């Protein structure tokens, strides 16, 4: 059977996910002196992890139930620490930077992954990879900088990128040495992340503040629920795509989805962007695609 349904499903789910994230994190709550801002990134990530874990459990218990998970629990916990940290830092960065900036920054995983591989794994890559990474760096420099300095948002984005690179390294290691399945990956990572986040929010006292804030603006509850549902559906479709087409197709689909998400964020939410900055993003995405093509 022809299977373009993977592309359509992933694209729609993650496009709506990006729109919802823009609406939530950078939304306007209240007017005048009563105006507030969304500072509860931990709770958002906690809800997302809970929904992802539920969906992964459903998928495992219905689909491909004959597998046995050989991964050690401590490996799952260690990877989940970095995964949760990356997601929380990326979500919190939106408190300072525009959403297109956050998407573009978080789309540069290859740079940190290659740096970790070279410095820690002492791996080697073909000349194409270095040239592709060169294009990404040039595009980011052209976008993130202008002739006319780094604040908290850029530092948060850098930390999130580093944690994403660490998470990728750990996932690759344990997939190679334990044959970890994607569904088990999702389920265990999200379970550990939700446990840690629940502990953190409960002992930080942020849960009560979030509850009061939601009471003030009840509309946010529906947005958060839809955000979690879209994330989970996109995760399931990503799993199905990798099963039916491998990781290369998934990477290409995610890259094009990210580009369209940036375009939609600029068009709809009236985010200002100079024509020179457009060259930066197009160069970054071209480099990402070429890197995907040339391994």
């Amino acid at each position: 059977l022809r299977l373009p349904l993977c592309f359509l499903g992933v694209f729609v789910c993650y496009f709506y996910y990006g729109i919802l994230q823009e609406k939530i994190t950078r939304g306007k709550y209240g007017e005048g002196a009563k105006q507030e801002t969304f500072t509860f990134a931990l709770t958002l990530v906690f809800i997302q992890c809970v929904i992802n874990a539920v969906f992964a459990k459903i998928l495992i218990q219905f689909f491909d139930t004959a597998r046995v998970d050989h991964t050690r629990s401590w490996l799952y916990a260690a990877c989940s620490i970095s995964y949760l940290g990356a997601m929380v830092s990326s979500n919190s960065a939106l408190q300072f930077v525009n959403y297109p900036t956050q998407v573009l920054g978080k789309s540069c995983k290859p740079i940190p992954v290659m740096l970790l591989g070279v410095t820690l794994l002492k791996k080697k890559y073909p000349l194409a990879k270095y040239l592709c990474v060169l294009l990404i760096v040039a595009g980011v420099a052209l976008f993130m900088y202008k002739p006319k300095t780094v604040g908290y948002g850029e530092l948060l984005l850098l930390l999130s990128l580093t944690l994403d690179g660490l998470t990728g390294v750990s996932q690759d290691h344990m997939r190679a040495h334990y044959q970890t399945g994607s569904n088990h990956m999702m389920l265990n990572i999200n379970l550990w992340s939700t446990l840690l986040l629940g502990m953190g929010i409960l002992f930080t006292g942020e849960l009560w503040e979030f509850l009061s804030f939601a009471e003030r603006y009840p509309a946010i509850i529906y947005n958060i629920l839809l955000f979690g549902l879209t994330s989970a559906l996109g995760q399931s479709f990503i799993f199905m795509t990798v099963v039916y087409f491998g990781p290369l197709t998934c990477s290409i689909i995610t890259t094009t989805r990210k580009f369209f998400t940036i375009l939609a964020s600029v068009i709809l939410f009236a985010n200002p962007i100079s024509p020179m900055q457009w060259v930066g993003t197009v160069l970054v995405f071209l480099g990402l695609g070429l890197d995907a093509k040339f391994g």
């Epitope: 004959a66 046995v68 050989h70 690759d172 997939r175 190679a176 040495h177 334990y178 044959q179």
Partner: single-chain antibody
Framework: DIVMTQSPASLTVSLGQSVTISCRAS??????????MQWYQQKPGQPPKFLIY???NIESGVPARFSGSGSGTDFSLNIHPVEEDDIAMYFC?????????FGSGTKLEIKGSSGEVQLQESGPGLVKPSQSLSLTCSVT?????????WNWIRQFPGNKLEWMAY???????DYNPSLKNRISITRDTSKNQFFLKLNSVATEDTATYYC?????????????WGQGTTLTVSS
């Protein structure tokens, strides 16, 4: 299921020569850059000795003489200097799919001729066809609820190894699909034993049954083996 073929059935070698043993698989056994292959050595009358996990990595304590290679569907084991110590049968087994399979085995011969575990099998020796049989493996020096996989393996006459089932320390168990309808594996943590039950045994079940401990890393590795128990089914 995957079928492993070893081309040289028997090799005649002189001491100090370099010998390469090939092993070909019916399907690709790579997974995210890792070749899920293992190599074992079995002296006559002894349980197999675990040598290599993955295509290349060498188990700690094995001499530097042994060295694996190959990728995809074709693999080979190389012993550059060969001494009288390492003249034995060599088996290659994949771990890509749930039914773990072993190669037919290659025989070498001289031309011109707290971590320690004690596995112990027990059970009836002579049985009649269609009877119900139960094999007990007693573990001492380690707790079966602590870690590692506890498997049951049998070797038919002709040295054809066959993995049967295992029960993990969690209690999760996996079975050979060809035998899932005939056998059941259980454990008794109080006495530190795990049993295997065979119902309606046939003459084809005559073999030597081993209970072996294993750990998963680049595949399942049966590092520790019991001495094995001989089961004979005769009308």
């Amino acid at each position: 299921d995957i079928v492993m073929t070893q081309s040289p059935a028997s090799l005649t070698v002189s001491l100090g020569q370099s010998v390469t043993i090939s092993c070909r698989a019916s399907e690709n056994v790579e997974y995210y850059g890792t070749s899920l292959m293992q190599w074992y050595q079995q002296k006559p009358g002894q349980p197999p000795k675990f040598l290599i996990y993955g295509a290349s990595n060498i188990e700690s304590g094995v001499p530097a003489r042994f060295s694996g290679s190959g990728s995809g569907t074709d693999f080979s084991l190389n012993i550059h200097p060969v001494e009288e110590d390492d003249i034995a049968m060599y088996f290659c087994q994949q771990s890509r799919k749930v039914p773990y399979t072993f190669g037919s085995g290659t025989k070498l011969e001289i031309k011109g001729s707290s971590g320690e575990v004690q596995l112990q099998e027990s059970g009836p020796g002579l049985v009649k066809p269609s009877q119900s049989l139960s094999l007990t493996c007693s573990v001492t020096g380690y707790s079966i609820t602590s870690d590692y996989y506890w498997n049951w393996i049998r070797q038919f006459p002709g040295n054809k190894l066959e993995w049967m089932a295992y029960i993990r320390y969690d209690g999760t168990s996996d079975y050979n699909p060809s035998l899932k309808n005939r056998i059941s594996i259980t454990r008794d943590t109080s006495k530190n034993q795990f049993f295997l039950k065979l119902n309606s045994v046939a003459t084809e079940d005559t073999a030597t049954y081993y209970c072996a401990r294993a750990y998963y890393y680049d595949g399942i590795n049966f590092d520790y083996w019991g001495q094995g128990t001989t089961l004979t089914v005769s009308s």
